Structures are given as C-alpha cells and as structure tokens.
Amino acid sequence: MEVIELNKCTSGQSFEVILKPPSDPSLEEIQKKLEAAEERRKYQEAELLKHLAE
Amino acid sequence: MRECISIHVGQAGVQIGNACWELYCLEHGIQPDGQMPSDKTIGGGDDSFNTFFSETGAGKHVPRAVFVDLEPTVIDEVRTGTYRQLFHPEQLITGKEDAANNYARGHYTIGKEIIDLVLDRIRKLADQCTGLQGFLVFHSFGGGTGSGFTSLLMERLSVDYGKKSKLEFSIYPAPQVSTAVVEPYNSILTTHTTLEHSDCAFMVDNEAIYDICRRNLDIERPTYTNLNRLISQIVSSITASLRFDGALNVDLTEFQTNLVPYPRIHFPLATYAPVISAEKAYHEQLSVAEITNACFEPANQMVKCDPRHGKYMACCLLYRGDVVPKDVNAAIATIKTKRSIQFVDWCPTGFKVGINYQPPTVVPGGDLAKVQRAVCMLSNTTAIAEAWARLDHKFDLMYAKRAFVHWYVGEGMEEGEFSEAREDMAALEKDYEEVGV
Amino acid sequence: REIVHIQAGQCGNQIGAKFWEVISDEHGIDPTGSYHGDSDLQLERINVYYNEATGNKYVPRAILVDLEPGTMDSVRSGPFGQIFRPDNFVFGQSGAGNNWAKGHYTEGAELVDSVLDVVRKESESCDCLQGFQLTHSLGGGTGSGMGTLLISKIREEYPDRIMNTFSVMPSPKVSDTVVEPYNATLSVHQLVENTDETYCIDNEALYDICFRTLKLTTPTYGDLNHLVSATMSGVTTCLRFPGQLNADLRKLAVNMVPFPRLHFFMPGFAPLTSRQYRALTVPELTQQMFDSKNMMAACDPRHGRYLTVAAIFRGRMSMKEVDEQMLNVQNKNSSYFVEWIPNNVKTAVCDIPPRGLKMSATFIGNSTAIQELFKRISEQFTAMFRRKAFLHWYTGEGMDEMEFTEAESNMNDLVSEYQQYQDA
Amino acid sequence: MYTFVVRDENSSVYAEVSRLLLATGQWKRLRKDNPRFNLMLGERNRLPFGRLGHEPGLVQLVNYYRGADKLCRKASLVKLIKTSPELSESCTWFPESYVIYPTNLKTDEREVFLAAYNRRREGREGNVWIAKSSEGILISSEASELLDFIDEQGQVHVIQKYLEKPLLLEPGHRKFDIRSWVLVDHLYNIYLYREGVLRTSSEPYNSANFQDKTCHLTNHCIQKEYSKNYGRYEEGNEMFFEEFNQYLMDALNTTLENSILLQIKHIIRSCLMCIEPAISTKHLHYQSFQLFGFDFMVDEELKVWLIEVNGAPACAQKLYAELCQGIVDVAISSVFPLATSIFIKLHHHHHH
Ligand SMILES: Nc1nc2c(ncn2[C@@H]2O[C@H](COP(=O)(O)OP(=O)(O)OP(=O)(O)O)[C@@H](O)[C@H]2O)c(=O)[nH]1
Numbered sequence A: 001m002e003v004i005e006l007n008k009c010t011s012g013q014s015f016e017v018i019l020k021p022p023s024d025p026s027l028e029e030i031q032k033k034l035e036a037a038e039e040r041r042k043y044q045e046a047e048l049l050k051h052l053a054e
Numbered sequence B: 001m002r003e004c005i006s007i008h009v010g011q012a013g014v015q016i017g018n019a020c021w022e023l024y025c026l027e028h029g030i031q032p033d034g035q036m037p038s039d040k041t042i043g044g045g046d047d048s049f050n051t052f053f054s055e056t057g058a059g060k061h062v063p064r065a066v067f068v069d070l071e072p073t074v075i076d077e078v079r080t081g082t083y084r085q086l087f088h089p090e091q092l093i094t095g096k097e098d099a100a101n102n103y104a105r106g107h108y109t110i111g112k113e114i115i116d117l118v119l120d121r122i123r124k125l126a127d128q129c130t131g132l133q134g135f136l137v138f139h140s141f142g143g144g145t146g147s148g149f150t151s152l153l154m155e156r157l158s159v160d161y162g163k164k165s166k167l168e169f170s171i172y173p174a175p176q177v178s179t180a181v182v183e184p185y186n187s188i189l190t191t192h193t194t195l196e197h198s199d200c201a202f203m204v205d206n207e208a209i210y211d212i213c214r215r216n217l218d219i220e221r222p223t224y225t226n227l228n229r230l231i232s233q234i235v236s237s238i239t240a241s242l243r244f245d246g247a248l249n250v251d252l253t254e255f256q257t258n259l260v261p262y263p264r265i266h267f268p269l270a271t272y273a274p275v276i277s278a279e280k281a282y283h284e285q286l287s288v289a290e291i292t293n294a295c296f297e298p299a300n301q302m303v304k305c306d307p308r309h310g311k312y313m314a315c316c317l318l319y320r321g322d323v324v325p326k327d328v329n330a331a332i333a334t335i336k337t338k339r340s341i342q343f344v345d346w347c348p349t350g351f352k353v354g355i356n357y358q359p360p361t362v363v364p365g366g367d368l369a370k371v372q373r374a375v376c377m378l379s380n381t382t383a384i385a386e387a388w389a390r391l392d393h394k395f396d397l398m399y400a401k402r403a404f405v406h407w408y409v410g411e412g413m414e415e416g417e418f419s420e421a422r423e424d425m426a427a428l429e430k431d432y433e434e435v436g437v
Numbered sequence C: 001r002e003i004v005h006i007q008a009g010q011c012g013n014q015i016g017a018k019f020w021e022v023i024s025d026e027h028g029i030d031p032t033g034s035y036h037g038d039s040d041l042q043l044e045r046i047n048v049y050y051n052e053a054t055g056n057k058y059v060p061r062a063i064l065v066d067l068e069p070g071t072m073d074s075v076r077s078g079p080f081g082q083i084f085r086p087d088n089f090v091f092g093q094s095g096a097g098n099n100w101a102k103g104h105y106t107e108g109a110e111l112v113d114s115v116l117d118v119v120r121k122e123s124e125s126c127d128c129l130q131g132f133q134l135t136h137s138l139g140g141g142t143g144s145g146m147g148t149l150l151i152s153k154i155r156e157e158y159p160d161r162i163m164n165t166f167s168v169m170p171s172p173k174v175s176d177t178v179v180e181p182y183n184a185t186l187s188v189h190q191l192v193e194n195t196d197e198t199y200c201i202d203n204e205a206l207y208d209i210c211f212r213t214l215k216l217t218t219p220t221y222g223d224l225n226h227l228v229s230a231t232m233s234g235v236t237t238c239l240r241f242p243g244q245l246n247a248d249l250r251k252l253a254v255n256m257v258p259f260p261r262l263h264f265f266m267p268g269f270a271p272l273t274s275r276q277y278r279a280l281t282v283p284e285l286t287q288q289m290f291d292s293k294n295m296m297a298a299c300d301p302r303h304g305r306y307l308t309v310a311a312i313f314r315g316r317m318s319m320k321e322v323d324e325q326m327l328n329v330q331n332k333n334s335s336y337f338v339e340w341i342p343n344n345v346k347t348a349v350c351d352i353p354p355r356g357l358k359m360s361a362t363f364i365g366n367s368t369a370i371q372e373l374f375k376r377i378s379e380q381f382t383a384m385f386r387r388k389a390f391l392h393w394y395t396g397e398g399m400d401e402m403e404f405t406e407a408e409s410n411m412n413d414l415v416s417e418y419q420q421y422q423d424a
Numbered sequence D: 001m002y003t004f005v006v007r008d009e010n011s012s013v014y015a016e017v018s019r020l021l022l023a024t025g026q027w028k029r030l031r032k033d034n035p036r037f038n039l040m041l042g043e044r045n046r047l048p049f050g051r052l053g054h055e056p057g058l059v060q061l062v063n064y065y066r067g068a069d070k071l072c073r074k075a076s077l078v079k080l081i082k083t084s085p086e087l088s089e090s091c092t093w094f095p096e097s098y099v100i101y102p103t104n105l106k107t108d109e110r111e112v113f114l115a116a117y118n119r120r121r122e123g124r125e126g127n128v129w130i131a132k133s134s135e136g137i138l139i140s141s142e143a144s145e146l147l148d149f150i151d152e153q154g155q156v157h158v159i160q161k162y163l164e165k166p167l168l169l170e171p172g173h174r175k176f177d178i179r180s181w182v183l184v185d186h187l188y189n190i191y192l193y194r195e196g197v198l199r200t201s202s203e204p205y206n207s208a209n210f211q212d213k214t215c216h217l218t219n220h221c222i223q224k225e226y227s228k229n230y231g232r233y234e235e236g237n238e239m240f241f242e243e244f245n246q247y248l249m250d251a252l253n254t255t256l257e258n259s260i261l262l263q264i265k266h267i268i269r270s271c272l273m274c275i276e277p278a279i280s281t282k283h284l285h286y287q288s289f290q291l292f293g294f295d296f297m298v299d300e301e302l303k304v305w306l307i308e309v310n311g312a313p314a315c316a317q318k319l320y321a322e323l324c325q326g327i328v329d330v331a332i333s334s335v336f337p338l339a340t341s342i343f344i345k346l347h348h349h350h351h352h
C-alpha cells in the first residue's frame, strides 16, 4: 500500500494511495434544427386554421 | 487562478443554486450583502475563492452565476431573497410561461426565444474572466426547462466556448417528489442531446436524498429545502477543491482526468457521510474509519445501486475536518479486506485523497448537525447504470403505446428523436456492461 | 396565470353562479366584491379567477351568455349577482328551444361575435392568459350548441391556449326534452376536437347520489348543483390556493392526457355532502373518493382501467397518511391502473378545507370506463335516429341528416378508442 | 393482501410455491410485468435486480441472490475456491480442478494442469480425471484425451480429479451422489433441509472402462434411459436418508450424522459464509432469498467431497410438498406475515 504525491498546505493535504497496479455541431446546424421544428409547428397551425375555415 | 461560471436552469437548478451559494458564502465568510472582511485585497485578487466570486471596487463579492427559468415565480424569490444584494439583476433571467413538463417545449419552442439572451448574459460574465475554465450546470432531468432548455444551452456553449470544460449536476427523477408522468421521456431526451457536450456529470436521485432525510434526519416528509441543503453539502464537497488551496481536483480538467477515463461513461457516483440530525440530543462523533466505511453503504449514495456488482474506474475521497493521511490509510486497509471492491483490469486499484481541515459548515436552523469530520466519495462505477436501466424501462412502457408523444410532436419535435434518444441510451447501457461484467 | 371563465345557457349559468358563490366564499370575497377574510392564503392566487378593481375590489373574470334573458336576470338577482362585471352579461331574446342547431347555426351565430368581444376585452387584460373554462350542459340548445360554437371561435382566435370545460351530460332520469341525446351527440363531437380537458358531469350520477346516499327523495336541480359546485371547488383547488403545485392547466393536461381525444375525465368527491359533524379519517377520504358511488359520471370504474388520476385532499391532515393511503389503493388494486403509464396517480394537498367540512377529497380520473357514458348517449341517439324522429326541428334550421350520421360515427369511434386501451 | 409475480414458469419448486401462496387467501398474483409486487419469483437469466426496491410503499423481495452465480457455475466455483483465502488452494473437500478454455477461444489453466498431471504418471497414482462444463463429459487417464475433447466444443470446461475410490452401496457395488437443499433467507440465516436424497447408480461400478458412463454418472436422466436396472433396488434410483442411515448403521457401524452430515454442514456453511459479504442484502433497498442444491460425493474413507452447487434446483417428487411449504414459512412469511422445523439452522461461533 504505497502513499505517493503527498502535498501539504495550511488548509489541508492531498495524496494518492495505490493498493494494486493495473492488472460538436455548428451554430448553423443548430439554428437550422430549431427552425425546421418551428416550420413543423407553423404547418400544423396552418392545417388547423384551414380546418376551422372549412 | 482560473474562473468558473455556474449556470442554474429551471426550478430545480435555481433552488439548488440558492442552497449552494448560501453555503459558499457561509464557508468563505461572505455576508448576505456581499462584504467579505477577511478579503484584505479590495477590488480584486486571484485567490482560489475568486474562481467562484468576482470583486467590485466597493468590495462586494459577486457570484459568477447565471440563473435561468422560463417562468418568474422561482427566480423572483431569489430577487427578494436573503441574498438579493449578492446577485446582479443581469444574472437573473426569467420568461413568462414555462415549458409545461415538456422537453420539446423547453428545447424547441421556448428555448429558441430566450437562448441568445442567455448566451449574452453568460458572455458578460465570461468577459470579466482573465481565464475561464468552463461551466458548472445545474438542472433537473424531469422538468421541461431543466431538460429541454439545458440541452440547448449545452449545445451552444460547445460552440461559443469549445475548449472549455462543462460539468453537470443533474437531479434524477423520483416519483416520491415528482412533477410529471413524462419525466422518463424528458430524461432520455436531455441525456441523449447533452451526452457529448458534458465532460462530467454528477447525478442526484431525488429518491436517495428523500430517504436519507427520512432515515437519518427523521424528517417524515422532506421538503425541497431539506433536499437542497443536503444536496448543496454534497456539491460543496465536490467543488471545495476549486475554491480552496490544495493540490487535488484543482481545475475542471482534473475532474475528467481523475474521474472519467472513458468520455461517455462520465457519471461518477457520489457517496456522503455522515448525515446527522440537529435534533439528536446525544451523538457519538464518528471516526475516520467509520465514515470511510460508510462510503460503501448504498444507503448513503446519491443513487441507490449496488457497486459490488459492477467495477470501479476511479475513486476519490474528499475529506473535511479532522483527518490525517495515516488514519485514512488505516481505514482503507481495513475496508479492502471486508468489502467487494474490484477495479477494471486497465485501471490501478487506488484512491485519490483530498483533505481540507475545516469541517463542513452547517446552515443555522438547518437539519444537519455539526460534525468534526465528513467525507464525500466520488467513484466512477458501472453500477450507476442501474439507474439508466430503471429510466429506460419506464420509457419503454410508455413509448410502446406512444402515450403522451403527441405533446412533443405538437411542439415541432419529430417522433424519431424519441427512438434515436432511446437507441443512444441502449448503447450507453451496453457500454457500461462491457466495461463492468 | 389568468383563466377566463364562460358560462352558457340555463344549466351553465346556474352552475356557474353557484361556483362563483362557493369559491368567493372560500376566498373571503363578499357579494359586492370586497375582501373580508382572515388569511393571506385566500388572495395569493386570487388573480387566476378575479380581476382587481379600483379600491382593491375583486371581480370574477367571468362572462355570462344566454340566448334568452330569464336565467341571467335571476343570476343578477341572486346572492353574488352584483359581483359580475355588468358589461359581461351577453344575452339574446330569442331562446334556443333546446335546439343544438339554433345554438350553433342560427340564433347563436348572431350573438357569438358579441360574446367574443367581451372575451377579447378580458384576454387583452391578462398579463399571461393560460386559457378558458366553460360551464354548460350538452342537452339543451344554448349551452350545447352555442357553447361549442364559442369553443370553435375561441380556438380560432387563441389556438395556443388551453380550453377546459365542465359539461353536464343529459340523462332520461333528469330530462327536459326528448332531443337531449341529439344535442349531446352533436356536442361531444365538438368537444373531442376542441377541448383539452372535459369534466364529464352526468346528471344520471348526480340524481342517483342525491337519491340513494344523500337520501333526498325528490332531488331538485338545486340539489344537483350543490354536488356540482362542491366538485368544481375541489377540482380547481390548485388553481386558487397556494401550494407546491402551480395553478397550471397545461401541466395538468400534459399529465392527464396520453392521447389527444381521450380527455374526458370522471370526477368524484368525498365526503358526499347535503345542504354533519364527524371527522373523516384520511383512510375514509381515500376509500370514498375512489368509490363508484362518489363518481359524478355514471360509469363503473371496475369496468375499465385508469389511464391517469389526479387526487386533491383538502384540510388539516397527515400527508404521510395521505401518501400511505394513496399508495395503498394503487398497490391494492393495481389491476385497474394501466401498467404502461408508470406512476400515473398524483396527489395534491391544500390546508384550506371547503366550507362546512374539516376534510374533503376530490377525484379526477381518466378512466376508459367513461365509454359507458358515451355508449349510453349513443343508444338513446340511435333509438330515435333510425326512425328520423324529431329531426324536423333540426332540418328546419338548415341541418342535414348527414351531419347527424357523422356525429354518431365520431362518437362511436371515440368509444372504440377507449376500448382499445382497456385491452392494451 | 400481499402481491407477487411469476417470471419462471419452468420452475417445479416455485410453481408449487406460487400455488401454495394463493391458497393462503392473503396473496394475489399479478401479471408478469406488473411492478407493484411484494414478491418476485424471477427468471433464471438476466433477472433485473437493478429495478428492484424503487417502488415507494412496497417492501420487495426476490427469490434469488444477485451474485450467487459465482457459487453455481463450475468454472466460477473453481475460481472462487482457489482465489479466496477462506477457501484457499489448501481446501480439503474440493477435488483438484482447473479452468481450461478451448483453443478456439484461448485466464486459462491448462498449463498448470499438465504440471500436476505429470507427477501423476510419474508418481504411479491414479490419474483419471473428469471434464465438464456449465451432456458432454469425459473421464480419461491421459490428458490429451481431455484437452482434445474440449477443443472440440466451444465453451469453457473444467478438468477435475475423478474420485476413483467412491463409496459403493451393497448389494450392487454401485455409485451415488448426495443432494442437499439449502435455503438462505433475507437475514442470511442458512437453513439445511432435513431431507436429502441419494441419486444412485443402477449399474455396478467399473474402474476399467471409463467410457460406458452409466455406472459412473449418477444423474437421474442418464439412469432411467441408458441403464439396464433403473428402479431395481430403490424407487426412482432415489435412496432417502432414513434408509441410507440404517444401511450405514448395519454395514459400517456408523450414522449418517457423524460420518457424513457434519462434513456436509461444514461445507455448506463455509461456501455461503465466504460469499456473504458480496451478496448479502441486509442493508439493501430490496431483499433476497434463494434455494440451493449442493451435490456431494462420498469416498470409501467416508470423506465428503463437494462436486457442485445448483442455483435453480428441482426437488425430489416426494419432498416438494414439505420443502416448498418450508420456503413459504421461513423465506416469505418471514417478511410478509399472514394473519418442529424441517430445517437445521447452520450456525457455529468457535472462539479463537
Ligand atoms: N432536489 C430537488 N428537485 C427538484 C427541485 N425542484 C424540482 N425538482 C425536481 O425536478 C423535476 C421537475 O423539474 P423542474 O425543475 O421543477 O421543472 P422546470 O425545469 O422548472 O421546467 P418546467 O416544466 O418549465 O417547469 C422533478 O423531478 C422534481 O422532483 C428542487 O428544488 N430540489
């Protein structure tokens, strides 16, 4: 059980104990996705208002 | 010194953010109006606490925080709160109508109308940073804002701040305190879109925190305030190494270095001990050995799961209070011979230890007693995948009938994003089982 | 936030009046709209249903609609008659003769734009309108025919707001005319298309309750409306009182409605009250509120399965005990809750109890057993329609038989939809 | 009224347990995928332990111990005994055994198996070995018969010392093994069922042709079909304890308790106490119990050897009634009370 890399300060200390050794898409793509979905919404609204107009 | 910006999204992220910043001020001796008398350098500095607070010429110490909710009731209580002076109005951002427990409404519909404003208020904080490490992101899985808007924010932060690290603190949904039947849907959806944008994520199961407050604080029905003061103790344990002198987990990159060897498996289990009622008349203070052993009881974990039936990839012990290395090592030695702790073949069997001599600070009138030593263990074990299995199963039951799906399609989401998200989760569950079995 | 309330026709205005009387008594507001209460809890959410007037007077955000003046003259003369904005009384002189066609196509069409003007004037005065609630019967002409016409127009002008109805179903046991199945079938087709949540209030059930458990031998409409206003108070509790759950119709809809057309809810109330002193225990509230005899829609819950349930407990009690009891009925009768919607039962508590009771519970169930209500209406419809009986009242207003055939088909479809998930 | 679910319909023992529970009038069975159960009688393969104990308002209990497969698969048991200090390489009651994968797939131990195999025809001693996997068995005196055989199939086998000097019952000069049923409850009490069975051979034992494997393998299946004399001496090739006891009294001047049962209890307790820290549910959010079948051999010196542990055993048909009733009493009613014990509790606290 080996204790290594011990560092001490007035606030505390740290160290490491070893028991055993080893055995992003664009802004353009995001704005497009957000507006494809906005288009799908405004389509669905238009189909409703067309249904209410009938 | 390098600054870190904290971002709180939705009800859960904002109310937990409140608890954390309350606790931070108590720990650094910062008063509700922002004055820190012990800060002898007026108007600036580059101390470790300056990672989380900035300074103004009048000596006010201002959190590097952004609060975001799509409805104003929750953040209004921040603006009228005990710590109203602490935060600058530009950092509190509200909409008028919320995401209605709907990931698609928070992501697509309402997200598009507020995202640029939020990235602008974020950039003003970043502009006051000589060196930005990245972000700590607080949110729920289950809310429409917490899930939907967060995933949108995380995508763009990758774009605007590509080399910065991003850490999550994520509230996993539990029926005992739950707000929506569709929380499994939202959880899967936000996990699928956020995965590649998160370097390290600490999951808190509201189930585990609830039962910890019932069993160990003898609170019959815990409130959000009970839950969040315990959560903020854990978060404070995890962040202390960014706010205090030390040599372990000193910047955000070390968290991925020390906790996350595989980037997709970036969900370390947190375990915290001891939790003691303030109404307990007589309490026998627990030793280094007893609290370290307690880090291997499932009843103290932030997510109930059984680490005996998984494998470890990394383990950190963060102690607070009267602890010295000799006693830690005596404690580890004994625990190794009495407990099942197996690492993956390609990792060292070992513990990274951090000690801070100041014991945990308690909130007055809180439910947590003062203790002379506490520990928070961060272990990346494959046993946490049990919570992905629970979530995915609930998702499968509803989605097999397309129950509630129409609410998402109606906001412009395509049904196929459901199955894409669910297949990503299917990959994640098997990644865990490859590593761990 | 703000909800705009509309009450149409005779039944709609009589129940709507009682509702505003009951909940204004709860919130401390007197007939002149002046506050006179104890707690500040009464007014934290007062704005969901009330506008604040000069001198901090509170006036219901309520519009009153009829095609004749009779009922609304009696509302104006009733207990809280002066609490309503006088400009919000919109009425014709013709009446609708219990005729859906007159309410929807001729007499009603003439008056409807006048109603929308008052709705618009109420909407544009709301910081953030969340939606509308309508009280009406389905068996007459104004509430049924014009009421659904208003719902169509309101959706056209506010397609992204929530539409919520309290809908009284006709019953031959409490019947004004033979054409009620016609009017109700025509109305249901509209409701399934254009509302987000409909509380199905069956005059059948209300009579049986008044008869068998309240032991009132000849129930008047007044006795029926006591049950309705008590139930309406209960279902709107979270809309009116401070709680850890917000006054949110949309979040309710999202959690109650897994499929868009299946938004017809079976309400229930406990303890069943008449115009008594013994404390009800939380175990008693819970068992009674789920009792088929406390259901306001004459459907046996054991004949279908619960998709979702919302439960609202009122009064001073152990939420630990409420939680235990709620979890108890679910685990004790897990057969009747669909297993493919996890955790489909949600409970809310509010410390403020209704007048006259120290403890009550209100039940809101989305059961597939509601199909029994629609089959019952369908069989009554078909018994007359197969002989085209009484159709001339409708064809005389421009309607064609085809429109009846379509309305009957769409309601039978709705019945099949419910049957599909009762076996899924 | 308690609730339960059945997820293994191919289970003789829990079929009867399922039926006995409803007869109480205080247990109602739910559909297989209803999650609002108190009790899960689960599947044998990939039982979803991670979904248990997260239903508020329900104490939940399952009829299997997560992790108990380490005992109940031949390769793992070998691995477990050698590697654990509480079993140790120095373990007097397990036949010498070795893990060997086919070369189709390549740790493996066939290197160290050779090392002892050679001191065995060096040293003159009987070098007969068995080979089997978790149907397909081989008993040969020369190793390449063994390793050849396992190359031929695709799964990992174990080579184990074949006990060349077994105890033979007379009349018959015939082999047998002993099966013992063990119930571990949620409290990790270890219960031995008072009744075991001897699975006898119908064939006289023969140490010259290890190829006709019906006097060599005591299995109930291999005996009713491929054997001349199935049922000659004992009904169903099943000798029970009262008879086997009186035989030991008449023929060998001993009892079953002294000569054999103390060893059996010592073995059961040592195995289960070894794995207890790894499988115990004492502070878990759900709870476990499990029925085990331990299989033993007895050599001529009356020394007991453990051959394997079965994690999903069937019972002897005469014994289902009493044993399954026992399971309900101490493993189920233990947790969910309804409105002369057939078990011996295995407990020993020697101080040193
Ligand atoms: N621990 C904890 N969990 C919370 C808190 N607030 C909400 N939650 C959990 O978060 C989930 C609901 O998400 P919210 O954050 O409330 O919803 P939201 O992000 O505001 O999004 P909206 O749908 O627009 O309201 C549920 O699982 C709640 O139990 C909190 O203060 N503390």
Ligand SMILES: COc1cc(-c2cccc3nc(-c4cccc5c4ccn5C)[nH]c23)cc(OC)c1OC
Binding pocket: B178, B179, B180, B181, C235, C236, C237, C238, C239, C245, C246, C247, C248, C249, C251, C252, C255, C256, C308, C309, C310, C311, C312, C343, C344, C345, C346, C347, C348, C364
């Ligand atoms: C339950 O009572 C009510 C609840 C709510 C309400 C308000 C905000 C978030 C909510 N999340 C749920 C909820 C969560 C989980 C399951 C649920 C519901 C509802 C039915 N199930 C199966 N409910 C909410 C609003 C109400 O009025 C508008 C109301 O009164 C009927």
Ligand SMILES: Nc1nc2c(ncn2[C@@H]2O[C@H](COP(=O)(O)OP(=O)(O)O)[C@@H](O)[C@H]2O)c(=O)[nH]1
Binding pocket: C008, C009, C010, C011, C012, C014, C015, C096, C097, C098, C099, C137, C138, C139, C140, C141, C142, C143, C144, C168, C169, C170, C171, C174, C175, C176, C180, C203, C206, C221, C222, C224, C225, C228
């Ligand atoms: N519960 C209840 N039902 C009513 C009341 N008044 C009328 N009804 C029922 O409503 C239907 C008649 O509709 P009504 O409102 O009188 O006609 P409208 O004026 O054209 O809308 C019949 O089914 C009546 O039984 C009432 O005060 N309470």
Ligand SMILES: [Ca+2]
Binding pocket: B039, B040, B041, B042, B043, B044, B045, B046, B055
């Ligand atoms: Ca300074």
Ligand SMILES: [Cl-]
Binding pocket: B160, B161, B162, B163, B164
């Ligand atoms: Cl960058």
Ligand SMILES: [Mg+2]
Binding pocket: B010, B011, B069, B070, B071, B098, B099, B143, B145
């Ligand atoms: Mg919110």
Ligand SMILES: [Mg+2]
Binding pocket: C010, C011, C140, C176
């Ligand atoms: Mg009338």
